[PDB]
Write a protein that binds this ligand. Structure first.
Ligand SMILES: CNC(=O)CN1Cc2ccc(Cl)cc2[C@H](C(=O)Nc2cncc3cc(S(C)(=O)=O)ccc23)C1
Ligand SMILES: CNC(=O)CN1Cc2ccc(Cl)cc2[C@H](C(=O)Nc2cncc3cc(S(C)(=O)=O)ccc23)C1
Ligand SMILES: [Cl-]
Lengths: 297, 305
């Protein structure tokens, strides 16, 4: 029993965190094999700034050891520093681009040193509601599948509303953001409907059924209600993805949609679901299945 | 900016998780130097759980009855002893991944990270608090026994909890790393129930200071309160009594924001009376009590917005 926002064990990622200093700027880097990956803003016309730099300008520190930079190149908004030593702690890994609604763990670092780990979701507006201070740039987001780490996010900046923006590990930003000081704002955010439904199934699994009713609905009637409350449209794919949770609890996806419709139209009335007075949208159907099953790494 | 429930990086603890099997029971162990620590109920059957005589069950065991597995390697047990509700298995190999560590007993209200494991393999990490009733609201399934709670301050891991059981309400009970239970619990399957739980007042106040640091002041009022009048109101909402120690502990957060502890107590009094009226504090519609004054200082900046 119990339901917590759970992050993946961070150990395989901790062994890759390094500190990168270029001039007066100090941020975090990801050391995989003989390459250190970090935000290119550590050095705007980035090619013009980069052509003026030499290898010895980049100071890379792995714990108490100085790594020697022997090459450098840019890929989109990420800087790739060729180092003279391969990371002996390099885990099995892939660079993957996630979609809005998908969740990941973040290992927040300062000065190449990990300070904390938390779980979060890529919002529909492509920002993440993280917890970062100055020096956090270069902190990474990831998931684990058995022994393989899938790096999906590198932190670049904080927007005026306090939310965060960054790139995949190939330097491509999530969202209409640019790496520079300009008027940038997060677009209007929406609620991840498929995630809220998954969390209602998690509540039913943990013995919370007060919100269930005898009614069902069409996908078309529910999507009109979803549009009114700033909820993301629910697609047939989302319905298919919720299949296992529907079969496990005996509550059809459209049957659970009618419960969500009544929660949107009438509130919680002093009640909570899994210790929360708000409808939670940062647990995917897979997160619910994994946490209510016991999958290890 | 931002405020999340943050756990400590789990890497130093992952390198200590092992699997312990005794007969048909398999649970997790903590391998530090040449000793593996695990719940003593690993020597029990389900029948034994009603009235187990651990000393009688242990005297019938030999070293080779205990199977310890570290990854794909079998560790050899060369000794065994019991310390309170923990079994200590002497092994022939010291853990090369042993970090700098201490065993610390925490008090209710204190927070820690939990590395949840099954079969000596870590599956997830989360942050939680020792409730006033000595239980923890964790997320554990069968096979989680022996999972550990910890804090990492600097490079030293302070182990404070080892998981032993789930109570009928779904909450969790366990021991410190010396085998002493938190709460009036026994590692016996009897009528055991968690006492009535209360809200950790000093933690709720710390989280209100965290909200003020992140730029939100809508909940503040022009009133102050005495410590005794605050406790007379808060007890009515099942909040823990606030002591002079708690007031002293909130000192740095009060000085950083310029809001006296008893003025923040007056805002808390008003929040309990009025609710939130469609508003949230740090993205939450409930008053959060699982962030200590120390956690807030750690996660928040020294400059108030
Ligand atoms: C809000 N930041 C600023 O006004 C200055 N920024 C300008 C800038 C422009 C482009 C890019 Cl790609 C990066 C950046 C830098 C940036 O966003 N870094 C930060 C990232 N994450 C959390 C941060 C928390 C803070 S805080 C309030 O001190 O908690 C500050 C800075 C953070 C620096
Ligand atoms: C609720 N407990 C049981 O049905 C059986 N238990 C009785 C018992 C009595 C004393 C002691 Cl010290 C240990 C234990 C064992 C026990 O508590 N282990 C478990 C630990 N943590 C989470 C657990 C989740 C579950 S569950 C419903 O499947 O989520 C089951 C078992 C868990 C075994
Ligand atoms: Cl303590």
């Amino acid at each position: 029993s119990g339901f917590r926002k759970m992050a993946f064990p961070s150990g395989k990622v901790e062994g890759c965190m390094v500190q990168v200093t270029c001039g007066t700027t100090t941020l975090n880097g990801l050391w995989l094999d003989d390459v250190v990956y970090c935000p290119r803003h550590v050095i705007p016309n980035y090619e013009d700034l980069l052509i003026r730099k030499s290898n010895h300008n980049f100071l890379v520190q792995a714990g108490n050891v100085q790594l020697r930079v022997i090459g450098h190149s840019m890929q989109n908004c990420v800087l790739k520093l060729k180092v003279d030593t391969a990371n002996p702690k390099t885990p099995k890994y892939k660079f993957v681009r996630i979609q809005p609604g998908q969740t990941f763990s973040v290992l927040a670092c300062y000065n190449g040193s990990p300070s904390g780990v938390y779980q979060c979701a890529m919002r529909p507006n492509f920002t993440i509601k993280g917890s970062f201070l100055n020096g956090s740039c270069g902190s990474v987001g990831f998931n684990i599948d058995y022994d393989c780490v899938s790096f999906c996010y590198m932190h670049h900046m904080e927007l005026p509303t306090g939310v965060h923006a960054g790139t995949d590990l190939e330097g491509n930003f999530y969202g209409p953001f640019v790496d520079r000081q300009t008027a940038q704002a997060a677009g209007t955010d929406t609620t991840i409907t498929v995630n809220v439904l998954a969390w209602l199934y998690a509540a039913v699994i943990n013995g919370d059924r007060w919100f269930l009713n005898r009614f069902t609905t069409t996908l078309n009637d529910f999507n009109l209600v979803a549009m009114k409350y700033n909820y993301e449209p629910l697609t047939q794919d989302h319905v298919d993805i919720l299949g296992p949770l529907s079969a496990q609890t005996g509550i059809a996806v459209l049957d659970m949609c009618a419960s969500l419709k009544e929660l949107l139209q009438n509130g919680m009335n002093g009640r909570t679901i899994l210790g929360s007075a708000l409808l939670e949208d940062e647990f995917t159907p897979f997160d619910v299945v994994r946490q209510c099953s016991g999958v290890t790494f």
